[PDB]
Amino acid sequence: FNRYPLIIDPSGQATEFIMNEYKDRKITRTSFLDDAFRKNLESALRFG
Amino acid sequence: NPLLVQDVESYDPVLNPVLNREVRRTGGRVLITLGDQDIDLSPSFVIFL
């Protein structure tokens, strides 16, 4: 991808595939509704 | 990077977390809170006063 992907997975397989694929890089699952989105976003932007 | 600091009689208390090794490990990084901003502490750092 060039632009960041937007995944549409009604079955939930793609999210677990992404979890497994980037697990070695310490991938974090968050949500837009969660109030911790700001801190997680800033931490990701500063530390990969 | 190794660091040598002179005039230690004018010691800056900003070094207190660094000398105390008050590190916070999260996400594989080693976070040191130098004042108000977080810095990823590289393991090769050393300071001599």
3-state secondary structure chain B: CEEECCCHHHCCHHHHHHHHCCEEEECCEEEEEECCEEEECCCCCEEEC
Which method, experimentally, gave rise to this model? cryo-EM
For residue B18, count other CB atoms closer than 10 A to its CB: 17
The whole-angstrom separation of Cα B22 and Cα A8 is 43
Q: How far apart are CA B8 and CA A17, in angstroms?
A: 54
Min CA distance, A33 vs chain B (Å)? 22
What pairing do the DSSP bridges indicate for beta strands B2-4 and B46-48? parallel
Q: In angstroms, what CA-CA distances link A17 with A5, A20, A22, A29, A42? A: 14, 5, 9, 12, 24
Q: What does this entry list as its resolution, in Å?
A: 2.9
A46 Cβ under 8 Å from any chain B Cβ: yes
* Radius of gyration of chain B measured on its C-alpha atoms: 12
Please tell me the distance in Å from A25's CA to the nearest CA on chain B. Answer: 9
